[PDB]
Design a protein around this ligand. Structure first.
Ligand code: UPG
Ligand code: UPG
Lengths: 456, 439
């Protein structure tokens, strides 16, 4: 028997990447994977990823979910990715015919974390075991579970709220300063969805996380038996989730440029797929990279959605400035193969926004990190990284969205990143442990095997 | 459920390519696949290929087959690949525990066309349904099955079922040389094809008329195992010559390769180089002389080597033939007529000039010629047997490049081949039915 698993995706590369990689892992562990997609994708990158995955894996079936006509006026945010999540969630009662059509009969439904609350009852109607796919760190999962109780505890998130902690079971408490800024905005669409989903994580048969136990002390078994005692579903560490072979094109111009550089001399700089720095910050970062005195590779976005970023970098920085920066290092306003870049020998360090996918990529490839949180989960994930010893995160810089950092200080901190030996020593060890987790008999291998063995 | 299929390989890239590609295919059709391998492989290509497949497909298990120690004293042939088949065949009794060992329970076993006679009984003992993986054309398979009865019974017609006759001229030369290792082994295999449950052939119906579905009912009447067409077997997901090809106009390059295990005479290499220069066309030339340490500079010369480089691309190495054939610049293919390269040309829609040198090629060429996709010079005979001068070569290449009906046929047949393995297609259907019966 080869267990049938259907995966329910949402919008956004941050959510999509671990879903596709998990599909690849499942297929490569003798399971039937069917992906439930929706179109048109908010960004091209998503569509391309789906197409490539399908071309490499013809045995994965794709069922398109047809969303009900959507009225954006009802929605609180102008953010496309969130808007799509809600668009899917409002057409939840039409998953039932979809799922009923599928053959062979389904063993399991993996549902994205963003759409849990709306779609877990649909899985209940058909006696379908449901598992949430969690795209962020474990600490963040706990925070998301604990948050609804916390907002229920308070009269209002008024000025009474200062930077004091939120209690998390089995974890170090989280300061309000590290808490996602949108959380304080109750009635924000994302916040509403987060309260609902965080409330609904308990309903699923299990919570899948992209991590390994060594990455976060040895707290996870204890937390899990405690959860079992309280009747909560278990955390399943199935990470690190390995990139597919299609994610590697060894003929990229950035890679070719990287080949001619001294080893461990390049600094990689990127801030995710769904977020663009402010113009001032782009300029100052430009200054800082030159001021660092190091070789660098810089991925710039001037808009969140890749389709919309028509503007050239010649428009913002302008004329001779961009040329000047170009002399010092590789600059690009285009989609790059990031994992492939992280594996390169020339790359000594990573300036990241703290997104969990890229963070885990650096953990897997053993690249020291300089974390520059911008919003959301990223101040928490940062902390994790810092505790691992693989990276450092500058607290003086605060949130990137609400604070500006000048070129000089950027330069100095980058120099700090390049000079730090302990980070590099830890990188190797944590890298090898990361390997051991997914080796046969590893934590993640054991967990995965158990999951499939339940299905069975 | 995930049916478990075993692939029994034999030495030879020509046999191994369809094997590995069939592993990929079966995996892609929700089957578990275990490959049975033997070491040390004769050539590096086989080893590296297996490595690449196993790397790209972690869900495929590899079971090393150990063989009885063999003496090359008989050795009716000096061919390494053919000798390997004797090595594996003589150790057939060692196969039973091996095949009994694999879990989950095998639902079927696929065995190479070279070792059928000796390894089809092993299946019967374990109630294991067995299929033969045939590498060559439908016509050639028919001939192989038809030959034993023919030996039991000059350049005239040999009897074939469900097909136009074959001139003994077209018959592989080694058939005449009885008590050759190849001939003997083959005589053993052909009479044993019937023991197998089905015949897996890399082909589609549109490639050889509308007779293919009928030969199956006709065979069913005679109690013969059906011919199951699973082709075209697509290449698997696993740069300098390509980089050169990108600087070239569309349909302006002639591609020249004569297979994995064959090498031209020095004289013929000289004359082919001459014909390539005299052709007036850009070209990519793949040269063969694993034991090939001597540079092309040695054989051709150094002063001679420089002249050819000016008008084309010359290489003495393994190439990604399919990657080169899918390219737009390549307007035509000069091939030996092997079934894999021919099939890749059909898939990439490349017009071809066939130059049969030995083996099954003479049949294949006909098929090629019969399809309208390519042209073959009957005048040239066997390349191993005959030498051709530069003028004829160049002129004939000009004929190939100038040929426009071939391009049309190439497009249309590319479409047929594509439609074959799409859902509802003739080729995919037979696969679906096969896997459905496993069950
Ligand atoms: O030029 C690029 C840009 C992005 N990526 C990939 O995009 C993926 C996702 O990036 P990620 O690190 O997850 O951050 P974001 O997707 O931009 O942002 C949100 O996406 C996830 C949602 O759970 C969270 O991990 C993040 O904290 C959250 O900020 C990574 O694997 C990157 O390798 C590339 O390969 N090339
Ligand atoms: O430089 C090279 C040479 C060969 N190939 C590949 O080798 C494969 C097999 O070659 P093939 O066309 O099958 O001919 P051979 O293997 O050299 O010769 C024997 O191999 C097969 C055994 O059945 C038959 O198809 C042939 O007629 C028979 O002559 C092809 O797919 C080619 O793509 C390459 O990729 N690069």
């Amino acid at each position: 028997s080869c267990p049938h698993v259907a995966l329910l995706l949402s919008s956004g590369m941050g959510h999509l990447t671990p879903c596709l990689r998990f599909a690849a892992t499942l297929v490569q562990h003798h399971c039937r994977v069917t992906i439930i997609t929706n179109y048109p994708t908010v960004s091209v990158a998503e569509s391309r990823a789906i197409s490539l995955l399908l071309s490499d894996f013809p045995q994965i079936t794709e069922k398109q979910f047809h969303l009900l006509p959507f009225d954006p006026s009802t929605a609180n945010t102008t953010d496309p990715f969130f808007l799509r999540w809600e668009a899917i969630r409002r057409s939840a009662h039409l998953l039932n015919p979809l799922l009923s059509s599928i053959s062979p009969p389904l063993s399991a439904l993996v549902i994205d974390s963003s759409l849990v609350s709306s779609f877990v009852p649909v899985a209940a109607n058909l006696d379908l075991p449901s598992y949430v796919l969690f795209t962020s760190s474990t600490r963040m999962c706990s925070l998301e579970e604990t948050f609804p109780a916390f907002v229920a505890s308070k009269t209002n998130f008024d000025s009474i709220q200062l930077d004091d902690v939120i209690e998390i079971p089995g974890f170090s408490p989280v300061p309000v300063s590290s808490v996602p800024p949108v959380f304080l905005n109750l009635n924000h669409l994302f916040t509403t969805m987060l309260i609902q989903n965080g409330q609904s994580f308990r309903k699923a048969n299990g919570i899948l996380i992209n991590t390994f136990e060594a990455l976060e002390g040895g707290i996870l078994p204890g937390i899990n038996d405690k959860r079992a005692a309280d009747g909560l579903p278990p955390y399943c560490s199935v990470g690190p989730l390995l990139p597919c072979k299609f994610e590697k094109t060894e003929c990229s111009a950035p890679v070719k440029w990287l080949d001619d550089q001294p080893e461990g001399s390049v600094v990689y700089v990127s801030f995710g797929s769904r977020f663009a720095l402010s113009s001032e910050q782009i300029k100052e970062l430009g200054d800082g990279l030159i001021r660092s005195g190091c070789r660098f590779l810089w991925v710039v976005k001037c808009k969140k959605v890749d389709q919309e970023d028509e503007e050239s970098l010649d428009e913002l920085l302008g004329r001779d400035v961009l040329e000047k920066i170009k002399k010092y290092g590789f600059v690009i306003k285009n989609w790059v193969n990031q994992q492939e870049i992280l594996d390169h020998r020339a790359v000594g360090g990573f300036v990241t926004h703290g997104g969990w996918n890229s963070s885990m990529e650096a953990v897997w490839h053993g690249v020291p990190m300089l974390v520059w949180p911008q919003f959301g989960d990223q101040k928490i994930n940062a902390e994790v990284i810092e505790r691992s010893g693989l990276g450092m995160w500058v607290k003086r810089w605060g949130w990137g969205t609400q604070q500006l950092v000048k070129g000089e200080e950027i330069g100095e901190r980058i120099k700090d990143l390049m000079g730090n030996n302990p980070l590099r020593v830890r990188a190797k060890t944590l890298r090898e442990e990361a390997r051991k987790a997914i080796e046969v008999g590893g934590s993640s291998e054991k967990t995965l095997k158990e999951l499939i063995e339940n299905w069975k």
